[PDB]
Symmetry: C2
Subunit: 198 residues, 2 copies
């Protein structure tokens, strides 16, 4: 599958190559890239299926069984709500020591671990170990504006993640207000770690 | 690069990994082409957002974006031109490819670096565009969505520069005094106004 880090790296190299940037400058950029990278800040926000007709979108949704959406959190969502959600779910490989989230960043998505392990790190202290089936996010997803993260989350091994952007998620909930009220009341039962400052 | 080719690969990648059957994949590929436009597929990530200022300045002072040579930007300060230059994206557009489909929400402003395009409404040519032309709308800083009043199609291979309205708006909030001239000056440089 795709990896955001690798996609973002190639795109960074393209940009250096198309503009004939000088070696030293390029070097500065590649090491600053890997020094400042997080999946959270580099998520894929495109939506390939948005303009497709409802019937063709339904037909696609039927072939998806996204692990993220299997959580108890979604038990009460209508079929129309689950289909929409399943069509905006993304995935990404993550490398050991690669930051999923950097403390103080604005949360851009909720993430689901399909495989691999990760550590929560606040300051220089490990707060938790995350693994297959764990949901990472925040409890106040539907306000909304900015949610400032209270810890770093770093892959410990090679990880396979799924996720939904807060933007896409909020757009969907707005079309299913009834489910949204339950979502607020239910997400915390399934939330393994909550990044909301405080 | 080509957004069209990039997005095509993405669609096919998505089809392969979920092992969708042939007939469905075909309906999806045909639907993609039927509704494709550059405007709807634009890259909206910022590669250099989290880089430090010294680095960002150094990268920017190596760029000379044609879009920014327009009279419209004559009174912009260096920091503002540097910021915009860092979020300028390029895409190639092939002959017969739509830059804009009529009715779509405008996602960016577009500058033709090379090539020529036609503006089409009800199969009628409203305008022919070429090098140096600027395509967009006038009420750019308003938060509301802009519906395009026309189709815009490449006649030859085009090389386009663009800035998302989101990025543009963010840069303009940081330079309120220039944003005011932008808003009044863009008219003189807007070759085709897509606003309803």
């Amino acid at each position: 599958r795709r990896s955001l880090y690798h996609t973002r790296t190639k795109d960074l190299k393209d940009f250096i190559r198309v503009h004939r940037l000088p070696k030293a400058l390029a070097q500065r950029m590649l090491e600053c890239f890997q020094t400042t990278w997080s999946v959270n800040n580099g998520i894929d926000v495109s939506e390939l299926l948005k303009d497709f007709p409802d019937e063709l979108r339904a037909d696609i949704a039927m072939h998806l069984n996204k692990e993220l959406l299997q959580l108890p959190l979604f038990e009460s969502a209508s079929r129309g709500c689950l289909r929409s959600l399943s069509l905006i779910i993304k995935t990404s490989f993550c490398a050991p020591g690669e930051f999923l989230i950097r403390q103080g960043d604005a949360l851009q998505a909720i993430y689901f671990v399909c495989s691999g392990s990760m550590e929560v790190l606040k300051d220089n202290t490990v707060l938790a170990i995350l693994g297959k089936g764990d949901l990472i996010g925040s409890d106040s997803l539907t306000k909304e504006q900015v949610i400032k993260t209270n810890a770093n989350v770093k892959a410990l091994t090679y990880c396979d993640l799924q996720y939904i952007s807060l933007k896409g998620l909020r757009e969907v909930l707005r079309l299913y207000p009834e489910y949204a009220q339950k979502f607020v009341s239910e997400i915390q039962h399934d939330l393994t770690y909550n990044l909301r400052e405080g």
